[PDB]
């Protein structure tokens, strides 16, 4: 299927308590592979997957340098946005930046994007044609004209269609053993009485990768949307994902209920039945 | 009233360093450098004999702005002198350079008038024309969009001697943050 590369930046102003907190991370699909933390000790961009450790010192020097430049830009942009909105120097404020690209299974560019936020709200975003920006408000309109004048759009677009795609594909090849792994869920079911007219039936999905998964309960072949509790998919800590789905049923109509599990690592969708 | 000037000059390229020297014929024991605007700050320095040398760190847009230098003697009471002439320190190189052109042409007979015009596709609110041997720039607002360009004229009057001129654009809400230099233009008097 598709693959993606994504970078995430966060800068948080810490009035009085030194200069802002900067954190940058990079993902290929649902796997983290690099990070930078301004509070960390090394002051280097650091590896977080084994397949990227094969890059040499010149790589780590460039990545370190560029991210630190990014942190400075973010630092000063905190000052600029504080002025735009006439905010006091006493409060903490936050800039978030997400960008990256997707390739299809044929390895062709499918899209790219860049969006920025201030204090948790859309600030400015790159339109889907990659040639212009959408500003959320008057302050961001000032940023828009600066960015048109700085040719920011052209440089993001060049990046998104060029090295983003090239490096994503490089990485997928270097790390194909893990990144291209089909890792299907181990499944099992649990069953607990709640009273003497009802019981809970919980369908479990563990150890799966990637995180995209669908868990549905049926009853006599009809969906049970309203009465089903399900949790947000969650990391297991080891690079894998978990999710469950539960339904309260009358005793003992258990046989009428069916859990359906769809995941790309499964040859075909499972049906589980107690 | 102290003297306050920039070395090598008040137009500082991104990431470079500049020295704001404070100078006075009468001895002062103390120097204060105040930046005004949105990033207000005061640097303190003692000096020598009498003068002081304030170093303004790798240039970024939060270091741009108007500086004034004071003097006093001594600490309590802070008998603050008159403020020096303002000194605007500007960061350049942040956006696409505008075009610069001469009318009737960049070469002219002595006493004929000359008009330099700054142009860009980008929506600058104002232009800044600097001449090689002068410390201040002439400035002037951009017109409205005409044939997709934003433009300002600097009529210079009758020509005496040459000039190498350069032109910079900027935006209203950040008047000390200027685009790249236009290609330098040489004005000759035949």
């Amino acid at each position: 299927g598709s693959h993606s590369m994504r970078y995430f930046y966060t800068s948080v102003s810490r009035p009085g308590r030194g200069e802002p907190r900067f954190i940058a991370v990079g993902y290929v699909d649902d796997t983290q592979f690099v990070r930078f933390d301004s509070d960390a000790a090394s002051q280097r961009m650091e590896p977080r997957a084994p397949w990227i450790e094969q890059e040499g010192p010149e790589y780590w020097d460039q990545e370190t340098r560029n991210v630190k430049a990014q942190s400075q830009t973010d630092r000063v942009d905190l000052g600029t946005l504080r002025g735009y909105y006439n905010q006091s120097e006493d409060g903490s404020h936050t800039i978030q930046i997400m960008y990256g690209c997707d390739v299809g299974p044929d390895g062709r560019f499918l899209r790219g994007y860049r969006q920025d936020a201030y204090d948790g709200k859309d600030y400015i975003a790159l339109n889907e044609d990659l040639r212009s920006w959408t500003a959320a408000d008057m302050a961001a309109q000032i940023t828009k004209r600066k960015w048109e004048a700085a040719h920011a759009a052209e440089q993001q677009r060049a990046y998104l269609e060029g090295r983003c795609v090239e490096w994503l594909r490089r990485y997928l090849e270097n790390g194909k053993e893990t990144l291209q792994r089909t890792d299907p869920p181990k499944t099992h079911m649990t069953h607990h009485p709640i009273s003497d007219h009802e019981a809970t039936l919980r369908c479990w999905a563990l150890g799966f990768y990637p995180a995209e998964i669908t868990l549905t309960w049926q009853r006599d072949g009809e969906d049970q949307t309203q009465d089903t509790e399900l949790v947000e998919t969650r990391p297991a800590g080891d690079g894998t994902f978990q999710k469950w789905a539960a339904v309260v049923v009358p005793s003992g109509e258990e046989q009428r209920y069916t859990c359906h599990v769809q995941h790309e690592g499964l040859p075909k969708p499972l049906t589980l039945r107690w | 009233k102290p003297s306050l000037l920039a070395h090598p000059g008040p137009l500082v390229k991104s990431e470079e360093t500049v020295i704001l020297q404070c100078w006075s014929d009468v001895r002062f024991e103390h120097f204060l450098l105040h930046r005004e605007g949105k990033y207000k700050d005061t640097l303190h320095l003692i000096g020598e004999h009498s003068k002081a040398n304030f170093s303004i760190g790798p240039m970024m847009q939060d270091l741009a702005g108007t500086y004034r230098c004071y003097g006093s003697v001594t600490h309590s009471p802070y008998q603050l002198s008159a403020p020096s002439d303002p000194l605007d320190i500007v960061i350049t190189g942040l956006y696409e350079k505008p075009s610069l052109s001469a009318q009737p042409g960049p070469t002219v007979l002595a006493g004929e008038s000359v008009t330099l015009s700054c142009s860009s596709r980008s929506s600058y609110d104002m232009y800044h024309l600097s001449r090689e041997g002068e410390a201040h720039e002439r400035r002037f607002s951009a017109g409205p969009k005409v044939n997709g360009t934003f433009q300002a004229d600097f009529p210079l009057g009758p020509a005496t001697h040459g000039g190498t001129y350069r032109c910079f654009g900027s935006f209203r809400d950040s008047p000390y943050e200027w685009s790249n230099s236009s290609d330098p233009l040489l004005v000759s008097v035949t």
């Binding site: 970078y7 830009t73 400015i124 700085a150 920011a152 990046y159 | 942040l94």
Partner: peptide, 9 residues
């Protein structure tokens, strides 16, 4: 690889 291009807001 992250982006090298960046611009004040």
């Amino acid at each position: 690889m992250l982006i090298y291009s960046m611009w004040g807001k």
